[PDB]
Amino acid sequence: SIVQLVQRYRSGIRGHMKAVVMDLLRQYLRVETQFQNGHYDKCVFALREENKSDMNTVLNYIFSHAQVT
Amino acid sequence: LTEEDGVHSVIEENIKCISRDYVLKQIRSLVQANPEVAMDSIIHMTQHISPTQRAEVIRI
């Protein structure tokens, strides 16, 4: 719990205030790099296949990329 | 260890940062024993981004 206190704050407010916004941007990125790599249709089947087992997570996936612009 | 001159991890930035941070405290620490060197050090110290850096002291 103490190493987790420092884990909020080990690189100071500054690495983290970077890191966190940096992570979410990479969050946008990972999703949207697999999203567009050729064209939407053929790619969605590649989207379909990374997490075949469950589809509740998928609904947020499909929902996210609707307003890319 | 293996990837020399590769991409660095999060902590790698931190380890350089403590090393970088540690050198910085020494100059601060160095003036404490010998504050008279501070003033003369500035002309020499300013050789980087010098006009902005002289300005910052004047603002403060």
Curated annotation (Swiss-Prot), chain A:
It comes from the Eukaryota. Expressed in brain, placenta, skeletal muscle, renal, pancreatic and adipose tissues; expressed at low level in pulmonary tissue; not detected in the liver. The biotin cofactor is covalently attached to the central biotinyl-binding domain and is required for the catalytic activity. It is found in: Cytoplasm, Cytosol. Monomer, homodimer, and homotetramer. Can form filamentous polymers. Interacts in its inactive phosphorylated form with the BRCT domains of BRCA1 which prevents ACACA dephosphorylation and inhibits lipid synthesis. Interacts with MID1IP1; interaction with MID1IP1 promotes oligomerization and increases its activity. Cytosolic enzyme that catalyzes the carboxylation of acetyl-CoA to malonyl-CoA, the first and rate-limiting step of de novo fatty acid biosynthesis. This is a 2 steps reaction starting with the ATP-dependent carboxylation of the biotin carried by the biotin carboxyl carrier (BCC) domain followed by the transfer of the carboxyl group from carboxylated biotin to acetyl-CoA. Consists of an N-terminal biotin carboxylation/carboxylase (BC) domain that catalyzes the ATP-dependent transient carboxylation of the biotin covalently attached to the central biotinyl-binding/biotin carboxyl carrier (BCC) domain. The C-terminal carboxyl transferase (CT) domain catalyzes the transfer of the carboxyl group from carboxylated biotin to acetyl-CoA to produce malonyl-CoA. It is linked to Acetyl-CoA carboxylase-alpha deficiency: An autosomal recessive inborn error of de novo fatty acid synthesis associated with severe brain damage, persistent myopathy and poor growth. This is Acetyl-CoA carboxylase 1. It comes from Homo sapiens. The chain holds residues 967 to 1035 of 2346 of the full protein.
UniProtKB/Swiss-Prot annotation, chain B:
It is found in: Cytoplasm, Cytosol. Expressed in brain, placenta, skeletal muscle, renal, pancreatic and adipose tissues; expressed at low level in pulmonary tissue; not detected in the liver. The biotin cofactor is covalently attached to the central biotinyl-binding domain and is required for the catalytic activity. Monomer, homodimer, and homotetramer. Can form filamentous polymers. Interacts in its inactive phosphorylated form with the BRCT domains of BRCA1 which prevents ACACA dephosphorylation and inhibits lipid synthesis. Interacts with MID1IP1; interaction with MID1IP1 promotes oligomerization and increases its activity. Cytosolic enzyme that catalyzes the carboxylation of acetyl-CoA to malonyl-CoA, the first and rate-limiting step of de novo fatty acid biosynthesis. This is a 2 steps reaction starting with the ATP-dependent carboxylation of the biotin carried by the biotin carboxyl carrier (BCC) domain followed by the transfer of the carboxyl group from carboxylated biotin to acetyl-CoA. Consists of an N-terminal biotin carboxylation/carboxylase (BC) domain that catalyzes the ATP-dependent transient carboxylation of the biotin covalently attached to the central biotinyl-binding/biotin carboxyl carrier (BCC) domain. The C-terminal carboxyl transferase (CT) domain catalyzes the transfer of the carboxyl group from carboxylated biotin to acetyl-CoA to produce malonyl-CoA. It is linked to Acetyl-CoA carboxylase-alpha deficiency: An autosomal recessive inborn error of de novo fatty acid synthesis associated with severe brain damage, persistent myopathy and poor growth. This is Acetyl-CoA carboxylase 1. The chain holds residues 2278 to 2337 of 2346 of the full protein.
